[PDB]
Structures are given as structure tokens and as C-alpha cells.
Amino acid sequence: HMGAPAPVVVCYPGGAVNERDADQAMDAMLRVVERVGQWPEKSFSSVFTAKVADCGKLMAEMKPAFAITSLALYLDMRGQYDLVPVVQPRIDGRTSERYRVVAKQGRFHDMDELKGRTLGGTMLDEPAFLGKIVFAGKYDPEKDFALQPSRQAIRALRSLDKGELDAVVLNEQQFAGLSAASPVETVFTSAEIPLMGVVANARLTSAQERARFAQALETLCADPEGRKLCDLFGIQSFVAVDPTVFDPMARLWLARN
Ligand SMILES: [Cl-]
């Protein structure tokens, strides 16, 4: 890098935070990581994309030591870039989340009854996570359902209310915001799915370098500036982890019908 900041690739799948404020927040996060980890300022810089399709190019080009990706991107790229976890976020005491399929009250009693019906949600653009992980490989979403992707869970839930959609797959945060019309009910709750945090290329980092970054993130949410960043994303803390935390997901990821 010859004195330039080292790149940290951030593949932001999307979320409650708009792209521009999420990108700014990554820069702010790195400034806190540097302070709490006692790096000189501008040791790192964020290379940000909200496009899943560009994540791979950014990884190959920037050759980053550290990155932030979705679980699906990690599982797909882990072998090529010898990726290992650095930290997971803890949210509401848990390092995992559950997805809920909701539908108008009384219409459907199980997912099998939604076969051939139309599904909405914000995580439908990349349906291998929906099929292999959320549904534990019991359904092939593109074959068994009509996936109507949405960019905002509000849009999907409006369509459900109208009757333009039969059910909506919701994250924890989206399921919490439901209250804020037609009666609805949860038709399906996923198993616990681990949360992604930061990862590292183990061919480009030492174990001790990963540990320093991890420890910095473990203390980030206590910092005056870091606290506001963890609030923005609803994060309780970050926790350092070994690779086995995602081994159960790797088993689901390999399964095919
Ligand atoms: Cl996920």
C-alpha cells in the first residue's frame, strides 16, 4: 500500500440504513477501530458496494485483509479467499436471527400450502440463501414459488395487504416493524441462522493481526463514537469467533435436491 490506507471491502446486502449513510458509517466505524485498536489514523479505508454482483470483483481487485459480506457471499467465497470469521454481531443477546413467513390470518396453515403461490420480501433477489438456509433445503424457492422481490419490506407488506402477494418473508427487524390492517399470522419460522460480521483473508493476515482487529471491534460499541454506530445498526456488541460458528451453515449450503 506504500503508506496508503489498507482497503476493507464492504458488501452491504442492503438494510434499514440507506446506502449513503451506511457507506459513511463504515468510514466512521474504521476511524473508531483505529482509535480503540491503537492504529494510526487512516490505516484503513472502506471500499463500499451495495451491489452483490460487484463484491467478487472488489475482492479480487483490492485483495483486502478484512471484509464485510452477507452469509451467502461468505459461504460462496470462503474457499477462494481463505476467509475466516473475525467477529459476529450480538443482537438482542443472540449471535443468530430467525426469518418469519407471514400471511393473512386463516389463509395458509403451512409452507406446503404456499407452494405455487407468490412470495414477497427483500431477500428474494438471491434465492439460494432463501432455499438452502431459511427453508433448510426443504423448498426450491424459484421452482416451488413465484418470488416477487421487493426493495422495502413496506412495499411487500402493502402488496400482501391488498392481496397482490400471498405471503412475505421478513427479517427480525422487518417483523418487529409490522405493527407500525388485514390480520396477519406467522406461517413459518426458520431455524436460528448465524449473523455475519467481519471476515478476514487468512492467506493475507496473521492470526495475531486478526486478533487485534477482533479485539478492536469487541470494544467498538463502548466508544463514544462507536456507540452511535452500533445503535444505528441495532448491535449490542461484537464477539470474536473461530470458523466453526458457520460450519452448520456450510452443511446446509452443500445440500441439493
Ligand atoms: Cl442471513
Numbering used by the authors: 22 to 201, 205 to 281
The authors write:
The aerobic methanotroph Methylococcus capsulatus was the first bacterium shown to synthesize sterols, producing a mixture of C-4 methylated sterols that are distinct from those observed in eukaryotes. C-4 methylated sterols are synthesized in the cytosol and localized to the outer membrane, suggesting that a bacterial sterol transport machinery exists. In this study, we present three putative bacterial sterol transport proteins in M. capsulatus that exhibit remarkable specificity for C-4 methylated sterols. We first used bioinformatics to identify a cytoplasmic membrane protein (BstA), periplasmic protein (BstB), and outer membrane associated protein (BstC).
BstB belongs to a family of periplasmic/substrate binding proteins (SBPs/PBPs) known to traffic bacterial metabolites such as phosphonate. The 1.6 Å-resolution structure of was determined by experimental phasing, producing electron density that allowed the unambiguous building of a model of BstB (except for one disordered loop spanning residues 202–204). The structure comprises two globular α/β domains (domains A and B) that form a cleft at the middle. The domains are connected by two loops: one 9-residue loop that runs from β4 in domain A to β5 in domain B, and a second 8-residue loop that connects β9 in domain B and β10 in domain A. These two long loops could work as a hinge to allow a bending motion of two domains to induce a conformational change upon substrate binding; this is often observed with SBPs/PBPs. The cleft between domains A and B forms a bulky cavity with an area of ~1179.5 Å2 and a volume of ~1009.6 Å3 that extends into domain A and is only accessible to solvent from one side of the structure. The cavity is predominantly hydrophobic, suggesting large and hydrophobic substrates like sterols are favorable for binding. The cleft in BstB is less open (~10 Å) than that in apo-PhnD (~22 Å). One of these patches in the central cleft could be modeled with a chloride ion engaging in polar interactions with the surrounding Glu118, Tyr120, and Phe150. In this docking model, the sterol was positioned in the hydrophobic cavity in domain A with the polar head pointing toward the central cleft and domain B, adjacent to three residues: Glu118, Tyr120, and Asn192. In contrast, the simulation (150 ns) on the MonoC docked complex which had a RMSD of 2.6 Å for the entire length of the trajectory and did not show the same conformational change as the apo-BstB simulation, which supports the idea that the apo-BstB structure represents a ‘partially-open’ form of the protein.
